[PDB]
């Protein structure tokens, strides 16, 4: 009946936590999304075809008459002509470059594809890079490690029904990343009052005191975690653990050591 917009989803240097995050959506659920809203035409984690049959499915999708949107999960290993990351005997950098070329839009799910992620952390043995840096094209970034499904599905639905949303200096949709974690944190009054837990065993910790002295990066991290929560039930600081700053570029090197503010 109604044609569903074609989506191609590539996996590069990733942990698959972003794919897992996506299927946690409940507005709508993943089945309703791929049955009614979009046409997920390639997705290695869940697709039935394998090997050459899967590679053909990808090439059929890239040549579709109605075009397609590209979702990229994971960073791009560039050392030795990109050979440390391959699929179907092709370097990941080469396949993403080919797919990015005719994409209607490119969405980077996760800090890895947006900015390079964990494999990019010093000393970066695989010379990994973010998509935009590796391809030389602008991308819509949905960062976090992994991002909230509300943010990813929200961006996808937005892109297909209203166009590209307003993006911040780091390519992140302002709808979801326009506020600091810290500004919506329920422990903010403890912070204002200088009431910090000195350790995890302390009474201060048991009383729910601010976790800044323990390394919390909420004050420099843009995300909506305390507003929307994860899995409809929790978020790190609610669980008594400091924010690591997982939605910020190169956080692996700029936010460490995680348990300090130095």
């Amino acid at each position: 009946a109604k044609h569903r917009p074609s989506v191609v989803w590539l996996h590069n240097a990733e942990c698959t936590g972003c794919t897992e995050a996506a299927i946690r959506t409940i507005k709508p659920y993943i089945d309703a999304l791929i049955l009614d809203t979009i046409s997920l035409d390639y997705q290695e984690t869940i697709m039935a075809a394998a090997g050459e049959a899967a590679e053909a499915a990808l090439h059929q999708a890239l040549e579709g008459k109605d075009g397609y949107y590209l979702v990229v999960e994971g960073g791009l290993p560039t050392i030795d002509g990109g050979q440390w990351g391959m699929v179907a005997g092709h370097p990941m950098i080469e396949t993403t470059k080919k797919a990015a070329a005719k994409a209607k839009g490119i969405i980077c799910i996760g800090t890895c594809s947006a900015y390079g992620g964990v494999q990019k952390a010093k000393p970066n043995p695989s010379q990994a890079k973010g998509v935009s840096e590796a391809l030389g094209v602008k991308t819509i970034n949905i960062p976090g490690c992994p991002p909230n499904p509300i943010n990813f599905v929200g961006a996808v639905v937005h892109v297909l029904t209203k166009g590209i949303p307003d993006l911040d200096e780091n390519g992140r949709p302002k709808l979801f990343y326009g506020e600091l974690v810290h500004d919506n944190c329920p422990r903010l009054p403890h912070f204002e009052a200088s009431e910090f837990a000195p350790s995890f065993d302390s009474e201060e910790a048991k009383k729910g005191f601010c976790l800044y002295e323990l390394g919390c990066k909420g004050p420099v991290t843009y995300n909506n975690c305390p507003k929307v929560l994860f899995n409809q039930v929790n978020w790190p600081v609610q669980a008594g653990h400091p924010c690591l700053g997982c939605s910020e570029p190169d956080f692996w090197d700029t936010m460490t050591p995680f348990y300090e503010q130095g």
Partner: protein, 544 residues
């Protein structure tokens, strides 16, 4: 009998879909049967190299990103690893909370694997359209507990949804499936495909609840954030209302496990009984999990309710104790520099060196873990055999219920069918213990809410963190020097299972299990997928 072609030649499957990560499988076929195999991991990231020189407290946050499917397990192994190096013993509530989050991970991981990664190798979704809903409802009454989602009405709606989807011409994730137009290796009647398919869609919703249950204690899923050196940070997770919600969600997930997962698994195994003689191996290793005493690696090995041990040559009459000093990794057939063979993890070396695609001398980014020179299978099957041999009561009852239902000997479990059944078996056992474990922590946390112990960072030390993740024996090994990470090595279940050959050219478990695989249709080699998927491969885990 088992469909087999007369094909002689090579077959390459790349990518292996419906797993975590990037795997390339090569086989030599002769007269429709696999005579030789190679497991080739296609991605290197290098977490071990990245951790060098960093704060030991940061390790868990880096290593958790080894994998987003078996999320949490690495954060747990790293926490145990560093807790051991600083010689701190975690409070009882911390042991309980850590083990419960692991239990929730088992439930989520195995449900998703069976339905969303494995099932499409046995179930022909398109043939579900050929089924009569009323005949499927009646058949569903003869293979599984009574439920509204199995009514003719429900199965018709599923069929109607599927029919509109297929009639659109946009087959999405089913594009070019090996089952399209029919396939000789797919045995299930249309009525069973329809039942399985309805449950496939239901599991998509149920997994969201299993993740919510885990996030109540873990902070969020994927990638929990509640563990710290010396215990846990989640005081809220010891309180009444959160644990009541945790129980309610867990009970929903377990009802789905017992009403759908086990019954679907048993039906499928019933039709594919011939797979009880395909894909078997001989040696099994498990570090054990769900211990009553996690104050040290030794205590973990000895008090794990899912017992640890080593079985060799299928001898269920001799379960040996795990010798952590007898573990080492070879790199002879891996993409690493020469001179790194036979290294114990404490002396681990990660020096990447690529050659070329399909180089029979160097064909994987995974190292080859060996135990006293032997390849070891790890995971649900290993745990099941070890627990059964030791007469673990819960495993004996369930293994026996399965053998009684399938009318097969216990030796039939040394196979791809057993490996698949084992995963279901332990899921049922975890489910049976959830209410007991939750009550134990509820009462303890109400009484005393201590959750994290005091500790001190030593100038120099070492430690090992053990866990039996959903895929098998996991171990993290740290050397601390100058209060920093000097060496940090991961030896992961998929490394044991899917790594390449060792220094003696000895095949790994998956390579060995692939030998003798019948290939009905060389163009659509589903049989290779069945066996490989049975091991539940996680390549990002394997290589890290």
């Amino acid at each position: 009998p088992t469909p087999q072609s007369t094909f002689t030649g090579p077959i390459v499957v790349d990518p292996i879909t419906r797993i975590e990560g990037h795997l390339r499988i090569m086989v030599e076929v002769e007269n429709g049967k696999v005579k030789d195999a190679w497991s080739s991991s296609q991605l290197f990231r290098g977490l071990e190299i990245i951790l060098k020189g960093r704060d030991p407290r940061d390790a868990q946050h880096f290593t958790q990103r080894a994998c987003g499917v078996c999320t949490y397990v690495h954060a747990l192994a790293s926490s145990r690893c560093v807790d051991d190096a600083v010689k701190v013993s975690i409070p009882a509530n911390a042991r309980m909370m850590r083990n419960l989050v692991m239990a929730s991970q088992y439930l989520h991981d195995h449900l998703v694997h069976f339905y969303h990664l494995h099932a499409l190798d046995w179930v022909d979704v398109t043939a579900a359209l050929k089924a009569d809903p009323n005949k499927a409802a009646k058949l569903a009454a003869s293979i599984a507990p009574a439920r509204p989602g199995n009514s003719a009405k429900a199965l018709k709606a599923v069929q109607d949804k599927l029919k509109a989807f297929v009639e659109s011409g946009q087959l999405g994730i089913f594009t070019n499936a090996y089952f399209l137009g029919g396939h000789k290796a797919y045995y299930l009647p249309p009525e069973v495909d329809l039942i399985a398919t309805a449950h496939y869609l239901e599991a998509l919703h149920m997994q969201v609840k299993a993740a919510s249950a885990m996030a109540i204690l873990g902070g969020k899923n994927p990638h929990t954030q509640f563990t710290v050196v010396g215990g846990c940070s989640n005081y809220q997770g010891l309180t009444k209302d959160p644990l009541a919600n945790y129980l309610a969600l867990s009970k929903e997930v377990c009802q789905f496990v017992n009403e759908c997962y086990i019954p679907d698994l048993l039906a499928v195994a019933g039709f594919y009984k011939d797979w009880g003689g395909i894909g078997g191996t001989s040696n099994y290793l498990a570090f054990g999990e769900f211990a009553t005493d996690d104050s040290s690696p030794e205590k973990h090995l000895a008090t794990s309710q899912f017992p640890s041990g080593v079985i060799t040559g299928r001898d269920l009459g001799k379960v040996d104790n795990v010798d952590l000093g007898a573990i080492y990794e070879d790199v002879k057939y891996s993409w690493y520099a020469p001179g790194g063979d036979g290294k114990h993890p404490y002396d681990g070396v990660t020096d990447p060196k690529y050659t070329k695609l399909d180089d029979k001398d160097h064909y994987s980014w995974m190292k080859a873990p060996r135990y006293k020179g032997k390849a070891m299978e790890v995971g649900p099957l290993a745990r099941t055999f070890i627990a059964y041999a030791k007469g673990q009561p819960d495993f004996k009852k369930v293994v026996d219920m399965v053998l009684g239902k399938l009318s097969v000997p216990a030796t039939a479990l040394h196979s791809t069918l057993g490996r698949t059944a084992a995963r279901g078996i332990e899921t049922a056992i975890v489910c049976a213990n959830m209410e007991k474990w939750i009550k134990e922590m509820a009462d303890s946390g109400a009484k005393d809410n201590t959750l994290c112990a005091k500790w001190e960072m030593p100038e120099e030390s070492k430690g090992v963190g053990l866990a039996d993740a959903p895929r098998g024996a996991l171990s993290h090994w740290i050397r601390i020097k100058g209060k920093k990470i000097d060496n940090f090595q991961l030896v992961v279940p998929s490394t044991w299972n899917l790594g390449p050959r060792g220094a003696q050219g000895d095949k790994s478990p998956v390579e060995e299990a692939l030998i003798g695989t019948p290939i009905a249709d060389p163009k659509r080699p589903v049989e290779i997928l069945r066996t490989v998927h049975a091991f539940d491969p996680c390549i990002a885990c394997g290589v890290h």
